[PDB]
């Protein structure tokens with residue numbers, strides 16, 4: 001399978017990238033170095049992950065070593081919720097650029113559709129624990145993202161955790177200058193996302209699947225929770241193909257024409273997760289994996305459920 005997918009900005013995006021949420025700052029530099037050494041050319045980052053400086057050290061060292069050229073890398077970051085204001089977007093992007101030690105991003109995403117009050121706190125709360133919203137709407141934030149393209153800071157812009165009505169709002173924006181290139185959403189066999197994926201793909205928006213392994217290290221995991229990596233039905237498909245369960249879980253979105261961004265800081269697993277271009281799941285395997293959908297969503301916060309732009313009240 002081809003390694004890259006064509007975006008609606010004319011650039012090609014590697015379909016496999018390395019995730020970095022929860023990668024400890026003292027480990028992520030070596031994780032990214034190993035990833036680049038073993039073939040990764042796409043790194044998924046965010047300011048809110050608090051480790052972009054350390055990701056950047058790795059990128060810069062591999063560029064300096066001439067292991068890769070900058071044009072061969074595809075670096076993604078995301079605008080955090082406390083920066084949706086017009087006057088804050090450029091500085092937020094520049095802080096990410098300076099931390100990653102880059103002079104442009106390949107892709108910059110609105111991280112969540114929900115804007116929060118600016119300030120030092122990433123989740124400003126009222127005394128009852130509700131997030132304090134911003135009044136800047138997804139369309140004005142989008143216009144600020146478009147400016148970043150026109151200033152040369154980013155090659156492509158997109159969105160993340162937008163439901164189909166929110167995607168449609170962007171696509172219907174009066175005076176829209178650049179369509180979103182990507183919508184990055186949670187997607188795995190327990191949250192298969194058929195409706196939202198079909199909508200985005202029909203509009204030429206590439207979908208990136210996050211938490212493809214079910215985020216077993218998410219901080220709010222409970223013992224009662226389903227586990228993709230331990231699901232015997234998925235293990236059986238992996239055994240048939242002489243692959244690991246993780247390799248099946250990564251190949252699955254690839255065959256749906258999605259980009260996928262598994263996270264690891266374990267060198268062996270970073271290598272394992274990349275060895276997914278040499279086997280094929282059958283149509284029957286794909287439909288079987290899709291059948292495991294339980295609308296089991298791991299990434300969504302109680303503190304945000306009354307925000308006007310909370311994305312997950314809508315069916316999709």
Ligand SMILES: NC(=O)c1ccc[n+]([C@@H]2O[C@H](COP(=O)([O-])OP(=O)(O)OC[C@H]3O[C@@H](n4cnc5c(N)ncnc54)[C@H](OP(=O)(O)O)[C@@H]3O)[C@@H](O)[C@H]2O)c1
Pocket residue numbers: 018019020021022044045111160161184185209210211212213214215216217218229244246247261262263264265266269270272273299
């Ligand atoms: N846009 C958004 O709102 C959003 C939200 C969530 C995630 N994301 C992005 O998507 C990335 C991936 O999602 P995620 O971090 O939630 O979780 P994930 O990639 O589904 O799972 C990561 C977990 O799986 C483990 N793992 C990795 N490879 C494995 C393998 N071969 N065998 C067994 N265990 C393995 C990792 O352990 P070790 O690291 O210990 O090896 C880690 O505990 C994030 O890091 C972030 O970049 C974006």
Ligand SMILES: O=C(O)COc1cc(F)ccc1C(=O)NCc1cccc([N+](=O)[O-])c1
Pocket residue numbers: 021046048049050081112114299300301302304305310311
């Ligand atoms: O948002 C991600 O990329 C991963 O999850 C996080 C990463 C962080 F470093 C810090 C927090 C989160 C987190 O709680 N992310 C979840 C989240 C964020 C914003 C809005 C909502 N919402 O439901 O509207 C949910």
